[PDB]
Amino acid sequence: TSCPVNWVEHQDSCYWFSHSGMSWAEAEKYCQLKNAHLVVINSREEQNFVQKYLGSAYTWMGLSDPEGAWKWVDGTDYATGFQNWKPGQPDDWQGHGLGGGEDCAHFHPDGRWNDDVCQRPYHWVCEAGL
Numbered sequence: 001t002s003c004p005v006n007w008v009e010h011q012d013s014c015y016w017f018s019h020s021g022m023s024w025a026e027a028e029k030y031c032q033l034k035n036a037h038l039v040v041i042n043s044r045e046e047q048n049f050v051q052k053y054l055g056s057a058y059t060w061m062g063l064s065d066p067e068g069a070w071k072w073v074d075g076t077d078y079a080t081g082f083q084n085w086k087p088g089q090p091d092d093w094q095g096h097g098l099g100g101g102e103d104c105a106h107f108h109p110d111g112r113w114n115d116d117v118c119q120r121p122y123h124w125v126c127e128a129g130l
């Protein structure tokens with residue numbers, strides 16, 4: 001085993017899928033505590049692997065835009081990288097009325113992405129090197 005117990009190995013990364021929900025900031029903290037990061041989707045092949053094993057619930061990834069531009073937590077370039085947005089997303093929606101727009105990306109159960117309110121308790125995926 002190249003990955004720790006409770007982690008899944010795929011193509012030179014280890015992944016951990018939560019069975020619980022946290023805000024994006026608390027999930028980011030959790031992953032960093034484990035010497036990992038919220039998942040960064042680098043390719044269609046990795047998107048297919050992650051979406052196949054989602055827990056049938058909205059799930060945070062390591063993609064956010066609170067200071068204006070979309071950034072991956074590990075510095076992977078967003079604009080030249082893989083994208084898989086739901087139709088009409090991202091929309092920085094304000095109409096939830098919770099304050100501000102929407103600055104954190106998550107998967108829908110089908111794998112397509114949405115921007116949502118960072119404070120929402122969603123599932124998350126951690127990713128580390130082998």
Ligand SMILES: CC(=O)N[C@@H]1[C@@H](O)[C@@H](O)[C@@H](CO)O[C@@H]1O
Binds near residue numbers: 058089
């Ligand atoms: C979970 C989900 O996709 N939520 C979105 C939300 O982020 C916003 O984009 C809204 C605009 O009408 O459409 C949906 O409710």
Ligand SMILES: [Ca+2]
Binds near residue numbers: 028036037038073
């Ligand atoms: Ca992180």
Ligand SMILES: [Ca+2]
Binds near residue numbers: 039040041042046127
């Ligand atoms: Ca990755």
Ligand SMILES: [Ca+2]
Binds near residue numbers: 092103
């Ligand atoms: Ca935004």
Ligand SMILES: [Ca+2]
Binds near residue numbers: 089092114115
């Ligand atoms: Ca949205």
Ligand SMILES: [Cl-]
Binds near residue numbers: 018019020
């Ligand atoms: Cl958990």
Ligand SMILES: [Cl-]
Binds near residue numbers: 083084085
């Ligand atoms: Cl897209």
Ligand SMILES: [Cl-]
Binds near residue numbers: 092093094095
């Ligand atoms: Cl709006």
Ligand SMILES: [Cl-]
Binds near residue numbers: 116117118119
């Ligand atoms: Cl937000």
Ligand SMILES: [Cl-]
Binds near residue numbers: 120121
């Ligand atoms: Cl909520």
